[PDB]
Design a protein around this ligand. Structure first.
Ligand SMILES: Cc1cc2nc3c(=O)[nH]c(=O)nc-3n(C[C@H](O)[C@H](O)[C@H](O)COP(=O)(O)OP(=O)(O)OC[C@H]3O[C@@H](n4cnc5c(N)ncnc54)[C@H](O)[C@@H]3O)c2cc1C
Length: 502
DNA sequence: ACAGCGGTTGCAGGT
DNA sequence: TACCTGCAACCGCTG
């Protein structure tokens, strides 16, 4: 008959560099036999078949929760995957566990800001001590906005200048092994079913396993650390990394692919930063921001900071940053883009890899995002934002919204006369179309001369390649060489309108 | 005040 | 190779 200390997992699904978790552990061990520890994850079982989460991401979470539990097991504890909505769940477990303290990592997102505040109100209402920590991002956005006179920086170089005069907190290790800790006595839910708070098995989280592609990126802290060290092994590659030089269409990833791990917080962005810094010092010839690997981490920090200031960051309407652009509805052309049936092989190959594997290269993301928006289809960046939210393992509210606005030249980036060619952009790095042959296998017999542009080959040729256009592979839905120039003007028109308000 | 400047990742054509 | 200019000319930041 003791009191309960709760750490609440949401993001930051790791033991390493988790001050919010460490504080629970170091309190408990420094006050032996007076406490029970409940590291919890609150799962809403109602939202398992809501469109905007693909099966691939459900697998990632399932694997992450299973790892987190295995890692907590080693510290003489375990994970508690409590089912229900937080609003219902907390009051019950507050009374039945006799909770003295609650901790969690902060989340700048709106849906969470209001939910956390609602919990934090209830916390005070029940006399439950609450101590939050900022460990998702390297820099706390609210300090960045403050230090820049109550306004989030809208450019990168300004942002770099603001943050490099702020202290970077200590990076922590793994919490203490819990000394003298019996399993917390079974609450009212556990009495009726002992396995009530166990990790959801695949069957439980993944309700639509036919959407599941190859498991190229396993979830969890362990794989996050494994993949990081793997990348940091070639300290030369790390040092001279330049984002634009990385191929969008290489068969194996040209970049680190730590974004899903950074998204869920299986990898501490602080630790990745710290690990990179010491490599920089060891490698005399090394790249500088924005193109550097550390620069990429800073871009994450940049998009986060601006997103904290605007709760309408995911929308055009009501957005302090977003240029107002008269986007047009096209349910047909949206359907084609979403499933990789545009008729542009390069665009299709990327979209198909996204749906199948849940990750695509940044420049590949950039290529398809252009095509949908100002590039060709003139469809809103909010539309592709849904597709990405559904299909990305690294789905990040702030990063997704920020880069879509960057792309469509709604915010941050403005040189709209730079338009990605769905035909040319891919050829540079993949002259043979190995990427297209893999993901759009219909056209795998096509020569490198017209595999990027099948509409250039005759009917006899089409037959000889075993792929007749209109049957085995769609006719291109629009003509890029025509539409992009009309869209360039459409941009300028909207750009003028906007100054006429400012 | 308005103009010069740099700005993660355009394309084509060229050396 | 990894640069070069042309195509039009965008924004925010700085002084
Ligand atoms: C329209 C569009 C939507 C995007 N949506 C997301 C999203 O939902 N979630 C997401 O994590 N990334 C998103 N990206 C940004 C970027 O493409 C990815 O962060 C990157 O491709 C992830 O691969 P990586 O881990 O190998 O990155 P690396 O090149 O290896 O860089 C390492 C880390 O730096 C960070 N980073 C790199 N580029 C960016 C950037 N553009 N903006 C912010 N952080 C960056 C990532 O956290 C990444 O893990 C989007 C890009 C575009 C063009």
């Amino acid at each position: 008959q003791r009191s309960t200390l709760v750490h609440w997992f949401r993001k930051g699904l790791r033991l390493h560099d988790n001050p919010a978790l460490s504080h629970i552990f170091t309190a408990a061990n420094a006050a032996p036999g007076r406490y029970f520890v409940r590291p919890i994850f609150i799962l809403d079982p109602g939202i398992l078949d809501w469109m905007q989460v693909g099966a691939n991401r459900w697998r990632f979470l399932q694997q992450t929760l299973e790892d987190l539990d295995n890692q907590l097991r080693k510290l003489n504890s375990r994970l508690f995957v409590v089912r229900g909505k937080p609003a219902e769940v907390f009051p019950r477990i507050f009374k039945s566990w006799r909770v003295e303290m609650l901790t969690f990592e902060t989340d700048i997102e709106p849906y969470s800001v209001t939910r956390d505040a609602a919990v934090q109100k209830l916390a005070k209402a029940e006399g439950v001590r609450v101590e939050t920590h900022c460990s998702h991002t390297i820099y706390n956005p609210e300090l960045v906005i403050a230090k820049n006179l109550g306004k989030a920086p809208i450019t990168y170089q300004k942002f770099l200048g603001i943050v490099e005069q702020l202290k970077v907190p200590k990076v922590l290790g793994v919490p203490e092994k819990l000394k003298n800790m019996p399993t917390p006595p079974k609450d009212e839910v556990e009495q009726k079913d002992s396995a009530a708070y166990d990790c959801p098995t695949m069957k439980q989280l993944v309700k639509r396993p036919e959407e599941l592609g190859p498991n190229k990126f396993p979830g969890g802290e362990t794989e996050a650390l494994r993949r990081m060290e793997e990348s940091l092994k070639d300290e030369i590659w790390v040092a001279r990394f330049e984002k634009p030089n990385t191929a969008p269409n290489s068969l194996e990833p040209s970049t680190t692919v730590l974004s899903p791990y950074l998204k869920f917080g299986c990898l501490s962005a602080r630790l990745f930063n710290q690990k990179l810094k010491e490599i920089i010092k060891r490698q005399p010839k090394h790249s500088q921001p924005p193109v550097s690997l550390i620069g990429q981490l800073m871009w994450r920090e940049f998009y986060y900071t601006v997103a904290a200031a605007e709760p309408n960051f995911d929308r055009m309407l009501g957005n302090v940053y977003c240029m107002q652009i008269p986007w047009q509805e096209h349910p047909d052309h949206l359907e084609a883009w979403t499933h990789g049936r545009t008729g542009y092989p390069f665009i299709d190959a990327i979209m198909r890899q996204l749906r199948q594997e849940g990750w695509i290269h940044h420049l590949a993301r950039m290529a398809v995002a252009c095509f949908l928006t100002r590039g060709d289809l003139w469809i809103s960046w909010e539309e592709g934002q849904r597709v990405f939210e559904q299909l990305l393992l690294d789905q990040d509210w702030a990063l997704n919204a920020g880069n879509w606005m960057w792309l469509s030249a709604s915010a941050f980036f403005h040189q709209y006369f730079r338009v990605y060619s769905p035909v040319a952009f891919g050829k540079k790095t993949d002259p043979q179309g190995h990427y297209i042959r893999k993901y759009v296998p219909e056209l795998s017999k096509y020569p490198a001369g017209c595999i990027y542009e099948p509409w250039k080959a005759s009917l006899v040729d089409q037959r000889a390649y075993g792929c007749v256009l209109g049957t085995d592979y769609p006719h291109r839905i629009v003509k890029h060489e025509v539409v992009h120039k009309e869209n360039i003007k459409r941009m300028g028109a909207a750009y003028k309108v906007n100054r006429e308000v400012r």
